[PDB]
């Protein structure tokens, strides 16, 4: 295991409201700046059972198709509900079908534990997924009383020292808002080098500046240092 | 001319009239009168209406008190200015320009007035001037001579 | 620990006098606010916005939409009067002579410049360049408006030039009564004879006085330079008015105890028997916020009136004559 | 009228504000025709119990909420947050229906605030109640005793429940620190107490099928809404709009904004709706208020004339003789090229007066006469005569002392 | 002697005393204790109170 930093990454649009040149501040569930991130090399089976306390900041650095699974669930033995998400070329396979859970999360699709009665499915076409700039892919997750929000933004990243979360502000726009009522409290990745940048979320006031193009340029965390508290 | 004295009187009259008229405006009740409310409705229901009325009336009275305090501060500044003028103009000549009237101040006679004081400043105003050729100094047979 | 100052030790004695041997003419500067930013609110638009029913329910409320407007109008009239009791004390507008040979001085940075189309002085040009959807258009759509002053910049510039052309040509005569032409080397001698110095010092050191005065004007030209902390007393009132107008357009998005913050959502989700219970708390909160703003504006106008009276006293004593008051 | 008097003085008096009234109404709603099927809802045979809820998050439809008005007798509608008759124009985001067969007079405990046993360890609602509660007498269908074991009822729990949280449990309670290990000993049973029923039972003992469906009014794209129509969309015209429940007035022009695909609404610095997305084909609009302003009347005086002059503050003479100043559009006066002293202050240095027929004229302020005092190298002006003048100053020194009585002004007799 | 010096002190003292005493004054409510209103009457009307 290892620990990388979280300088100025983990900011997302809290509400669905366009604002130009404003300074808004909401008590949403953001990622604390300058926090620890459980760096896991999944190159090597790195398959922990990391919890889902108030959200997660899953990120990934790969080449083509290394990490393609974010299966959820809390008591994943025989009966609990889950959220299977693969990123094949056709579309997403978002499911909530409670079924069997195999201890080996290895993947093509090879898990295929058991099929039975389901509650919801999703075959959404807008799938979640230069040469030198391989990929800087991060996926924000959060469990609310209603839908299960998923934020992500695929951006190019330069090559540098051994892979760590780079410095630079980047807002996370939402992609899917599927309704769900799951009681998930864990995490599990699927893959057939890696980052596995898991970062836990917690409530904190975040003053975020909106530009005149409807994009977040910078954001304070109001809890890091007394300077931010004054800001 | 006599507007500074009428100003405060009219302001107080208008404030009193507004405060009296505020008693004829429903702040969210069925009627401005209180006895009709306490007679046509039961205590628990009429309680909300009478609370709204008493809150509105207390807010109006507090606004009146705040306006009166601000006006009293302004009138205190004016009274201090008047006292300074009466003490520096009447009780002795003052070499301050425009203070004891426009021009060279000579005298100041105070007189009573309703809620104020009307001064009578006596000023020295030159007139009928003529142009003359001047010079800083004149030259003697080797010494200078400046006007004392 | 704060340093109260240096540590001087005067040597008192039975027979010891300190008599100066050389003069150092210096020109200082003071900043005094005179006017403010006149404002006017719209009761039937700030409280109720595109909510006609809200206006019909606010009409029942007390006469609070007529006393606040009257207070704002009084404040506006007071602010328009403060620009006349200071910049306007001389009836006749004087004009500077064509030639510029006032003794040996260089009154060229205080006198108006005919070249630029603003008819102002380089000092005034340097002053009017450091005191400042857009926020102005945003506040206008919610009642908050800004009325323009009575006397514009050109009129104030002409008034300042008239108070200056009568101070160079004449001495303290144009202030008391009619203007009397007097040479400037003699006016300065008569002014020096009012502090104790005899007139045998200026006529013998006129060139040195002129050079020191020119150097003082030059240093003043650089005192009001890019240095931000110079015109602080003029930007403070502007920043206060801005932070007051921003705190009043922010109160329109605060739930005073209702289920929402729009006057068009409560009247489209609830029923009239229950609408008059949640639509009145917001009206009461907005009326309280507007009354607080009006009280703050009244206190600010009182402070500005005190400052304007002080500035008028300064203009009357220091400019229109010579004052023997220390500091 | 604005100042109560039949004799006004000479000056400028604010009276009202210029405002343009709308002349149309826009009620464009999302084009959708499917109806929410009520077969899988309370109008059905198979019902659920408080042990296992029936939560059906329905999709977009045009279901009219004024359909159950002819339901079984005694259909209570206690909407704590909305209005029952008003559920025909609001567009809700998502409706969360529910179903349970709670029995007894504890129907008042289902509403928020009550802390009954059902509200303690059988059901719970958040303190918003964005929807309504539907409860009716259920006796003709639950008369038989076969539905006793089909209608479950949980028992006390060592911890309080959570709003919108199912309480499915099958273990045995443990009082204190003595585990009974499955077998029911003392103070330890299974929270599966079955409700007892009877055909000829009491009135209060009869069960009640209660529906507590709720909503969520927020910025998310609404899915369900009442059945209404749609009209055309004008651009350069101040009209009324009802875009997706957002009711207001003002012009709806085309905006050159950059709304992201997930951003529907749009606010301003003061958190006011400045732009909205049409529920029809994607088009970015701009909600700007109607053309308003402020009026000002220039009156020379009551007993000196009968003419007036209107001053539209903040108008460019193209939004309402005619004179465009830096303060508004003065309509009713004429600008003379002369210069006089200010008599009626207006703004920007252009006062007015009632001078010679007799009409209201506008003129630039006169700061005074122009005097040119000659300055030579040697020219003194010594006066030769004096003119003693006596001026006068008016200064207040006091104020009428007043006193108020709370027990007589705030409260009458 | 110190009339104007004690006047401001007495005014500030009176203001602070009034501000600290108006906390035990029911502004049209059942009681003045926050917990008693929050717990001992009812959840719903506790908000209004
Ligand atoms: C967090 O990261 C720092 C720096 O890498 C490390 O010293 C520390 O042990 C980590 N864990 C905690 C709990 O601080
Ligand atoms: C969700 O799971 C957590 C994990 O233990 C549990 O404590 C909680 O009761 C569950 N339900 C809700 C509504 O959070
Ligand atoms: C901001 O928006 C304008 C709109 O025309 C565009 O020209 C400009 O490139 C944008 N700037 C950024 C940094 O997105
Ligand atoms: C001179 O000054 C000293 C103080 O240093 C004092 O003691 C003495 O009395 C003075 N003498 C006279 C004649 O003033
Ligand atoms: C007096 O001081 C000034 C300093 O500006 C200097 O220029 C001048 O020569 C001095 N004159 C005498 C007589 O010391
Ligand atoms: C007289 O004054 C004018 C302008 O003030 C100047 O140009 C001229 O040189 C002066 N002549 C003498 C002799 O001082
Ligand atoms: C006054 O000072 C300015 C400084 O820029 C200079 O240009 C001008 O020539 C001076 N005038 C006289 C009369 O010395
Ligand atoms: C129906 O509504 C959708 C929603 O965006 C829109 O894209 C489509 O153009 C509409 N079709 C018609 C015929 O109005
Ligand atoms: C009024 O309209 C004219 C012509 O369009 C324009 O030149 C002028 O700047 C406008 N004035 C204002 C105050 O908008
Ligand atoms: C001075 O003025 C007075 C009246 O103001 C006049 O009677 C007199 O003739 C004038 N001339 C003098 C006194 O030489």
Curated annotation (Swiss-Prot), chain A:
Disulfide cysteine pairs (residue numbers): 97-118
Reported impact of residue 87 to Q: Partial loss of biliverdin affinity
Mutagenesis / variant outcome for changing residue 1 to S: In strain: Gamma/P.1
Region (Putative superantigen): 211-231
Effect in UniProt of substituting residue 137 to K: Partial loss of biliverdin affinity
Top-level taxon: Viruses
Effect on the protein upon substituting residue 104 to Y: In strain: Gamma/P.1
Region (Disordered): 125-132
Start and end residues of each BetaCoV S1-NTD domain: 1-231
Glycan attachment points: 36, 88, 117, 183, 213
Effect of mutating residue 157 to V: In strain: Omicron/BA.2.75
Function of the molecule: Attaches the virion to the cell membrane by interacting with host receptor, initiating the infection. The major receptor is host ACE2. When S2/S2' has been cleaved, binding to the receptor triggers direct fusion at the cell membrane. When S2/S2' has not been cleaved, binding to the receptor results in internalization of the virus by endocytosis using host TFRC and GRM2 and leading to fusion of the virion membrane with the host endosomal membrane. Alternatively, may use NRP1/NRP2 and integrin as entry receptors.
Subunit structure: Binds to host ACE2. RBD also interacts with the N-linked glycan on 'Asn-90' of ACE2. Cleavage of S generates a polybasic C-terminal sequence on S1 that binds to host Neuropilin-1 (NRP1) and Neuropilin-2 (NRP2) receptors. Interacts with host integrin alpha-5/beta-1 (ITGA5:ITGB1) and with ACE2 in complex with integrin alpha-5/beta-1 (ITGA5:ITGB1). May interact via cytoplasmic c-terminus with M protein. May interact (via N-terminus) with host bilirubin and biliverdin, thereby preventing antibody binding to the SARS-CoV-2 spike NTD via an allosteric mechanism.
Protein's name according to its UniProt entry: Spike protein S1
Gene responsible for this protein: S
Residues of the full protein shown: 26 to 300 of 1273
UniProtKB/Swiss-Prot annotation, chain B:
Glycosylation sites: 131
Entire protein: shown range: 944 to 1091 of 1273
Name the UniProt record assigns to this protein: Spike protein S2'
Function: Subunit of the fusion protein that is processed upon entry into the host cell. Mediates fusion of the virion and cellular membranes by functioning as a class I viral fusion protein. Contains a viral fusion peptide that is unmasked after S2 cleavage. This cleavage can occur at the cell membrane by host TMPRSS2 or during endocytosis by host CSTL. In either case, this triggers an extensive and irreversible conformational change that leads to fusion of the viral envelope with the cellular cytoplasmic membrane, releasing viral genomic RNA into the host cell cytoplasm.
Coiled-coil stretches noted in the UniProt entry, renumbered to this chain: 6-50
Disulphide linkage map: 89-100
């Amino acid at each position: 295991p290892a620990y990388t930093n979280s300088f100025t990454r983990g900011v997302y649009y809290p509400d669905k409201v366009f604002r130009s040149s404003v300074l808004h501040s909401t008590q949403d569930l953001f990622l604390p700046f300058f926090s620890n991130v459980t760096w896991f090399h999944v190159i090597r089976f790195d398959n922990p059972v990391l919890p889902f306390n108030d959200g997660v900041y899953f990120a990934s650095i790969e080449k083509s198709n290394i990490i393609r699974g974010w299966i959820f669930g809390t008591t994943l033995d025989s009966k609990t509900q889950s959220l299977l998400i693969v990123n094949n070329a056709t579309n997403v396979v978002i499911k909530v079908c409670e079924f069997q859970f195999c201890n080996d999360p290895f993947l093509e699709f090879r898990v295929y534990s058991s099929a039975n009665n389901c509650t919801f499915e999703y075959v959404s076409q807008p799938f979640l997924m230069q040469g030198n700039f391989k990929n800087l892919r991060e996926f924000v997750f959060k469990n609310i009383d209603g839908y299960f929000k998923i934020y992500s933004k695929h951006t190019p990243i330069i090559v540098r020292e051994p892979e760590d979360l780079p410095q630079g502000f980047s807002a996370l726009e939402p992609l899917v808002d599927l309704p769900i009522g799951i009681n998930i409290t864990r995490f599990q990745t699927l893959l057939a080098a890696a980052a596995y940048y898991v970062g836990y979320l917690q409530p904190r006031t975040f003053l975020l500046k909106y530009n005149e193009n409807g994009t977040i340029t910078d954001a304070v965390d109001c809890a890091l240092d007394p300077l931010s508290e004054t800001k | 001319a006599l507007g500074k004295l009428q100003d405060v009187v009219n302001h107080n009259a208008q404030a009193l009239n507004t405060l009296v008229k505020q008693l004829s405006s429903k702040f969210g009740a069925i009627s401005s009168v209180l006895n009709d409310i306490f007679s046509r409705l039961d205590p628990p229901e009429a309680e909300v209406q009478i609370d709204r009325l008493i809150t509105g009336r207390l807010q109006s009275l507090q606004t009146y008190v705040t306006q009166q305090l601000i006006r009293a501060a302004e009138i205190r500044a004016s009274a201090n200015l008047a006292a300074t003028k009466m003490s520096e103009c009447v009780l002795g000549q003052s070499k301050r320009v425009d203070f004891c009237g426009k021009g060279y101040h000579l005298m100041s006679f105070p007189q009573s007035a309703p809620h104020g004081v009307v001064f009578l400043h006596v000023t020295y105003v030159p007139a009928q001037e003529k142009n003359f050729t001047t010079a800083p100094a004149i030259c003697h047979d080797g010494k200078a001579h400046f006007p004392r | 620990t704060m340093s109260l100052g240096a540590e001087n030790s005067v040597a008192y004695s039975n027979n010891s006098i300190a008599i100066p041997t050389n003069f150092t003419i210096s020109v200082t500067t003071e900043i005094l606010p005179v006017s403010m930013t006149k404002t006017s609110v719209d009761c039937t638009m700030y409280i109720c916005g595109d909510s006609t029913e809200c206006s019909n329910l606010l009409l029942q409320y007390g006469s609070f939409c007529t006393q606040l407007k009257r207070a704002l109008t009084g404040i506006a009239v007071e602010q328009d009067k403060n620009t006349q009791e200071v910049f306007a004390q001389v009836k006749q507008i004087y004009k500077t002579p064509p030639i510029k040979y006032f003794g040996g001085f260089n009154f060229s940075q205080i006198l108006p410049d005919p070249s630029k189309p603003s008819k102002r002085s380089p000092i005034e040009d340097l002053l009017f360049n450091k005191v400042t959807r857009d926020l102005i258009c945003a506040q206008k759509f919610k009642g908050l408006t800004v009325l323009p002053p009575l006397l514009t910049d050109e009129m104030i510039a002409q008034y300042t030039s008239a108070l200056l052309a009568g101070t160079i040509t004449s001495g303290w005569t144009f202030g008391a009564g009619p203007a009397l032409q007097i040479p400037f080397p003699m006016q300065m001698a008569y002014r020096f004879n009012g502090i104790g110095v005899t007139q045998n010092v200026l006529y013998e050191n006129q060139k040195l006085i002129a050079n020191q005065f020119n150097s003082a004007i030059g240093k003043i030209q650089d005192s009001l330079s890019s240095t931000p902390s110079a015109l602080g007393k003029l930007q403070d009132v502007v920043n206060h008015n801005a932070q007051a107008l921003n705190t009043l357009v922010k109160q329109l998005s605060s739930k005073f105890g209702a289920i929402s913050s729009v006057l068009n959502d409560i009247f489209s989700r609830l029923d009239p028997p229950e609408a008059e219970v949640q639509i009145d708390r917001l009206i009461t909160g907005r009326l309280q916020s507007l009354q607080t703003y009006v009280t703050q504006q009244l206190i600010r106008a009182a402070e500005i009136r005190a400052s304007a009276n002080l500035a008028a006293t300064k203009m009357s004593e220091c400019v229109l004559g010579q004052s023997k008051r220390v500091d | 009228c604005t100042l109560k008097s039949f004799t006004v003085e000479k000056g400028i008096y604010q009276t009202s504000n210029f405002r343009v009234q709308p002349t149309e109404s826009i009620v464009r709603f999302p084009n959708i025709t499917n109806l929410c099927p009520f077969d899988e809802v309370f109008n059905a045979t198979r019902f659920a119990s408080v042990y296992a809820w029936n939560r059906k998050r329905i999709s977009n439809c045009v279901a009219d909420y004024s359909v159950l008005y002819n339901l079984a007798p005694f259909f209570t509608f206690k909407c704590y947050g909305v209005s029952p008759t008003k559920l025909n124009d609001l567009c809700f985001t998502n409706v969360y229906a529910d179903s349970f067969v709670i029995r007894g007079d504890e129907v008042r405990q289902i509403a928020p605030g009550q802390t009954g046993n059902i509200a303690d360890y059988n059901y719970k609602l958040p303190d918003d109640f964005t929807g309504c509660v539907i409860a009716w007498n259920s006796n003709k269908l639950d008369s038989k005793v076969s539905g006793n074991y089909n209608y479950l009822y949980r028992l006390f729990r060592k911890s309080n429940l959570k709003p919108f949280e199912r309480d499915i449990s099958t273990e045995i309670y443990q009082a204190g620190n003595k585990p009974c290990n499955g077998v029911a000993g003392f103070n330890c049973y299974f929270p599966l107490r079955s409700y007892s029923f009877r055909p000829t039972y009491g009135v209060g003992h009869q069960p009640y099928r209660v529906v507590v469906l709720s909503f969520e009014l927020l910025h998310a794209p609404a899915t369900v809404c009442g059945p209404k129509k749609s009209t055309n969309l004008v651009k350069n015209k101040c009209v009324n709009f009802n875009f997706n429940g957002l009711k207001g007035t003002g012009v709806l022009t085309e905006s050159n904004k950059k709304f992201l695909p997930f951003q529907q609404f749009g606010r301003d610095i003061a958190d006011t709706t400045d732009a909205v997305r049409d529920p029809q084909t994607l088009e970015i609009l701009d909600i700007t208020p109607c053309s308003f302003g402020g009026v000002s009347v220039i009156t020379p005086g009551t007993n000196t004339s009968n003419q007036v002059a209107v001053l539209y503050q903040g108008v460019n003479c193209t939004e309402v003789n005619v004179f465009q100043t830096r303060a508004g559009c003065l309509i009713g006066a004429e600008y003379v090229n002369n210069s006089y002293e200010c008599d009626i202050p207006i703004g920007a240095g252009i006062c007015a007066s009632y001078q010679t027929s007799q009409s209201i004229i506008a003129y630039t302020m006169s700061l005074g006469a122009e005097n040119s005092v000659a300055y030579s190298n040697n020219s003194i002006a010594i006066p030769t005569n004096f003119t003693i003048s006596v001026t006068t100053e008016i200064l207040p020194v006091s104020m009428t002392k007043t006193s108020v009585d709370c027990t007589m002004y705030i409260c009458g007799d």
